[PDB]
Automatic annotation (TrEMBL), chain B:
Record family assignment: Belongs to the eukaryotic ribosomal protein eL29 family.
Top-level lineage group: Eukaryota
Record carries keyword Ribonucleoprotein: yes
Annotated InterPro entries: Ribosomal_eL29
Coiled-coil segments: none
Record's keyword terms, sorted: Ribonucleoprotein, Ribosomal protein
Region spans: Disordered: 1-35
A GO cellular component annotation in the UniProt record: cytosolic large ribosomal subunit
Protein name: 60S ribosomal protein L29
Example GO biological process: cytoplasmic translation
Chain intervals with Basic residues compositional bias: 1-30
Record GO terms (molecular function): structural constituent of ribosome
TrEMBL record, chain C:
Protein name per Swiss-Prot or TrEMBL: 60S ribosomal protein L21
Cross-referenced PANTHER family: 60S RIBOSOMAL PROTEIN L21
Keyword Cell membrane set for record: no
InterPro entries: Ribosomal_eL21, Ribosomal_eL21_CS, Ribosomal_eL21_sf, Translation_prot_SH3-like_sf
GO CC annotation: cytosolic large ribosomal subunit
Lineage of origin: Eukaryota, Sar, Alveolata, Apicomplexa, Aconoidasida
Amino acid sequence: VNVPKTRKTYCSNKCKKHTMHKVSQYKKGKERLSSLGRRRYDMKQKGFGGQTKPVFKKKAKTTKKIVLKLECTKCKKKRFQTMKRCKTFEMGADK
Amino acid sequence: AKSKNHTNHNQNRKAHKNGIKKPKKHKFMSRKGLDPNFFRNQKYCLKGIQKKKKELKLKAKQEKNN
Amino acid sequence: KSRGKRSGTRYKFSKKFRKHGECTANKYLEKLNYGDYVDIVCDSTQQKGMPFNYYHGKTGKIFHITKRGVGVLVNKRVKHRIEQKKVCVRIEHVRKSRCNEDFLLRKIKNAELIKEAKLKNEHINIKRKTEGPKPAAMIKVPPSKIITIEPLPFY
RNA sequence: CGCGGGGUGGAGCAGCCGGUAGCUCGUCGGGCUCAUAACCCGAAGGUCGUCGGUUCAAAUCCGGCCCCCGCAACCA
RNA sequence: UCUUAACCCACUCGUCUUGAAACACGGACCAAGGAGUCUAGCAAAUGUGCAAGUGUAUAUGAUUCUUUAAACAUUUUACGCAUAAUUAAUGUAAUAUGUCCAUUGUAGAUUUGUGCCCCACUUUGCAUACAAUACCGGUAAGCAAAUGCUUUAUUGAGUACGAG
RNA sequence: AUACUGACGUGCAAAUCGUUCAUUUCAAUCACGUUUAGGGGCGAAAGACUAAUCGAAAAGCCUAUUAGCUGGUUAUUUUCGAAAGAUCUCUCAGGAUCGCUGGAGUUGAUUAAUAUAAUUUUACCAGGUAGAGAUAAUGAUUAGAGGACAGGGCCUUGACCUAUUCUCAAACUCCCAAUAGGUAAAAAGGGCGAAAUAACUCAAUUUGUAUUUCACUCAUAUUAAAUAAAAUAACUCCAAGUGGGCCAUUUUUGGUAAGCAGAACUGGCGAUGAGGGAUGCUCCUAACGCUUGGAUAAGGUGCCUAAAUAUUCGCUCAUGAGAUCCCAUAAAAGGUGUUGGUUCAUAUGAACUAGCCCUGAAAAUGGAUGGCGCUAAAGCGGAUUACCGAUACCAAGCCAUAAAAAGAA
RNA sequence: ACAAUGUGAUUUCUGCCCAGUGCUUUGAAUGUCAACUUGAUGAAAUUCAAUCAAGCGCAGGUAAACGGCGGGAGUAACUAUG
RNA sequence: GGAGACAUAGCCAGGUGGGGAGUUUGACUGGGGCGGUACAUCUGUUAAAUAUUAACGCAGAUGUCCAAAGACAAGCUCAAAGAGAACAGAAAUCUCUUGUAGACUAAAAGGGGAAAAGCUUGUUUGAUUUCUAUUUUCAGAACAAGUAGAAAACGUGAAAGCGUGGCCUAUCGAUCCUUUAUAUUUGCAAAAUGACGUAAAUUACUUACUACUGUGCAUAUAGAGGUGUCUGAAAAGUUACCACAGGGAUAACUGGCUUGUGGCUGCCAAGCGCUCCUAGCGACGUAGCUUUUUGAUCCUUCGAUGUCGGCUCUUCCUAUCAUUGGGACGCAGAAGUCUCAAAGUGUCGGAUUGUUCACCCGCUAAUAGGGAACGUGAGCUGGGUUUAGACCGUCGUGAGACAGGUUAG
RNA sequence: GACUCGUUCAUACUACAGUGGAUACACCAGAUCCCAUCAGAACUCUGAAGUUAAGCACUGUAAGGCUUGGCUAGUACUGAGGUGGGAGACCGCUCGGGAACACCAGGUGAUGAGUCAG
């Protein structure tokens, strides 16, 4: 599935109207140590007793919902747009 | 372990024990979903009619007292 | 087994023969009021606003009208209870109902009859009375022109 | 009789990862040698089990039949 | 009353099981003992006492001292729950004040009258149901020089003469 | 301690006794004392042994451990009275939540009605299953005929065109039922008018829309089609039991079939006595306080066994006849047994036909129209009555429950 | 000599395979790979780097370690086999 | 003496670690298991003409693909067939005629679709933000999929209009957690971190006035990252050493229903039988009967009906092998062969087996076939399947397993 | 007589013929400009010289189809009842409801609003 790098579409906030946005792929971030659940989990895990939470070994999907980051040309805002679960994904280089 | 699947048996007969209940058929019905613009104008009209009734009632009462 | 939206509609949502393609504009022009009764009868060409299987050929009151939609309160039996359910349908699927039209015609004739009866100062009975009473009757057929019948024999 | 793998040259493997089917031995024509092989040079040969289907294009992918091998028959 | 008779009828009780007279299970017999309780918290029900309050808590007090281990009393903003909701939350929070009159409908209990008393009109119009407006907290959107604003949306177990 | 798988097997004994047999100078046997202790010991290994205890000893305790599972779960009368469907569930022997049930209340009701209704009527629709079709399409599918690309040896066979023709389909459809389903039959409303209100609406402040206030007026003084022990209706609350069902007719899917598995509609049983079905949870009749009497039902009337060896017309003899649904066998096929028919021929000869009967028709204790029996029936097929026949039905009494009257000298 | 195994008098011998799974031998050339430590950063917490650990990985050794020990065609002056 | 700042010991840390510990090893299920998914789903059909509806019913499909195959507009008509045209032929392109879709519509199957919903082209990104009422499943909760609108901003068309993904029916996922978006909204608990900002004042803890104030963490709202046993446990084997709780809700034993399979009896008439349908036969076909077969089954029994066979012992059946009486013959006699009344009477010795069965050798007069809880374990026996010991092969990493074979019980 | 906007959506379709052109429609002529392509074929624009030859209208045809009606047929089918029949398979009866194909006969449209020359 293929989207171009730019799209004229509605900005809701700080720009109030249809304008250009640059279009990019969300990369799914990365965890930091100072998160509350991780703090709790590390403390509980620590000491005698082995593993203290489930381990999600089971899996059924090789695919992912794709979610675009829309970055406003006019204003400094980001906006999300999510779309159908895909095994195949492309940016630019049209047919 | 080897179960029976289904039957509709007796359910209709059970329904007929208290009968099949039917609408209460109210003359007024809550109108949240009904046509914006036209319904807010109706709200203004209704408020207008209430105001018209209020103006009539207040003036008539004040006239009667005098 | 499966239970998707159009489940079991092969025969039911087929076109009638010689009725294929888009239907006349003048169907759509038909005028509807709030509190009309209206039948839900569906041509299969226009696919948006298509009601569920149960509501085909059903009748109910219009409670709401929109741009090309009509809300219709239809009764559905849900096990041990009938309840009123808000079926949104299209201009395409609404047919003006006819039970009301018999009442209207009946009222009109009755009103003229009421005017006449009041004018003449004599009571009338409106009632759509019984079928079964027959007066005494005559057969004037010649006595040898009557048809003589007997049972039918075998092959 | 129930599961799963496999049918391409005379023979046995490649292609078989969709279009252009490769290699060896075998076969065939010519050399070399009292003579014959070995040896050297050059060619010909595939219908891709069969009946139907997809796809722009099928020997290959998709089914059903036909053969071939591999599993299976245990607690009763 | 007991007792045999005789005519007609009369299959081991309990039990789980769709189904037991069973070739289903328990029971030789008799007597005594032998299994939905108690506490905690909660709910609805119905009674009772009081009501925008209620309970009197720990405890104090007394001309209270076999039974008294209860009964009686408590020298005017203690606490529980109820008298306000909303909400992650700083917080905010209920007609709108020209009027001691006191939200709008439609049915609806009750009342005046007319033409002993049912009546047939009218007449007045609670509970409650169905709706409706208002208005408050949240959230939008529009605005924003902050006594934050704005018709409009939405949302709460809301609120519109307190019931606990 | 090998065998007699001896005796014994409520013993002499919770492993004894008899006879047989292995061992007998060594890895020998015996004593006493001693060591090693419980997930521990010790084991020439068999998971062997560790005090009638062992794939984890004995004692005591946490403990009344836990158990969706098994068993049991205690006086009386009266009233209402089910479900064995459903959804989700590490769920399929369970639970929760729906359904059906009860209690309690309130609302409605008392005005023979209106609300209301496993009902029809008259209007009004919606259909594509049964059926029917191949000359309508799809898939089949058997024949010839008539015509202008190919095969065989200018001639012939085909295909192919054209009109036909035979038989067809759960998952084909030109057409198309019955049954089942929905809307409808007027007063909190509807008519036709006026006036108001809008920030909706059109060019257009009546141009409409919708709403509101005033009018005029629609059957119901038998009710805008019937009929209705139609409020025994609603509605709220709180809760139970239940979630393994089964049987029958009819439609029905799988399976060779099945008292088999699986569905549909309805009725039963379950949860149910009573009378018949010879007997029999379910078939038929019919649902039940206590009693008296009647007359009937299903069903009977040869006797057992209550009423007819009734009447009346046929048919029927069997060297294994036959005899009341479910129901306990029975067919294709024959018959110069007898009885009716019907077509032919010349009261005779043919041919068919279906009624009875016969053959087809073999099984396991002794053996089953229920038994005895029955043939001028007590058989089979009719009809005609009478009689007998229930706790069902009618009248009467008494009991309780429910409702209604009526009542605070 | 002690500890640990396998086999089980005598007699006769004990074929192949270190790939797999084991065990085992060498190590900064060497891939991965921890705490502490060391430096960089920021106002600090922090955030980053850096470090011959063993192990594994790479490379050997070992079957009286665990173990394992194929399938088709064609071919001989009768016929058959090969 | 020897060793020596290394050991060692303590505390951290990585690794190794079935030596030992604690635990997991689904469900549906024509029994269990290998298998499958009927476990989340979508189509048609089954389904009995509203709808409803089950099976390990049937024919199937699913976990995607799409910057165009989306959106709007404009133009066009497809498949095919005939008649023509250099290379060029059965197919290549071009033309004229004929062409209700026989094409195509991403992919299943079914519906819909001809001035399109197909094809070509133009312009584009609405495959946008916010919100209801709802419809589907159904609790009429969730999620998911839809429909009809509304508030915005736009895109497209000449305008009317249409556009909130794919012509419709499929293409999917809670809480907690993580992550990135978003905010003149918030918090981190006695206080503060812009900025001494703007004014005044000036002995100083002066005095006013200011929407925008550190790192880190927490929120709130919105997505995404996944649970396919798909309303959501982090979970492999094994027991022939085993124990316990239940179970006729469920096998192995009888019985029962059925009779596919087996067995037995038919009907027929093409052939065979020199010649000749039927003396004897009898196909291709077609009807019954039975349960001495094997099944199908799961009604009955799991707080037990002793699990094979032999021995022994008696009785019943006939579907008669012989003995008695016959009928027919393809019969000269001798025989012999088919057949009927017949169940009075008889039907053996061994060899080999765990054996029903089977198979030799021999007698006989012939050496028929069955029933009796698969006749017959408080009649016996204990050889066998089938307790616990053991062996070999194969399979299993292993522990172990084997309607594989063997010995001891 | 003619045309425009329509409506029903075959009586309106299809096929082959014949009949008709005052006004009108159409066929037809041209390409500068707007426009459009390979092509003035179409489409666009501009003409008005000719013509019923076509389009179109009307009618005909043993037309085909569609469409009504009869007849198929009270046949097939079917709801309820029955201790009705039949060995079963199935078939009557009582109360009811009731088709389809073929065939045969007829028909081949009607209509709202506006306009022009009568």
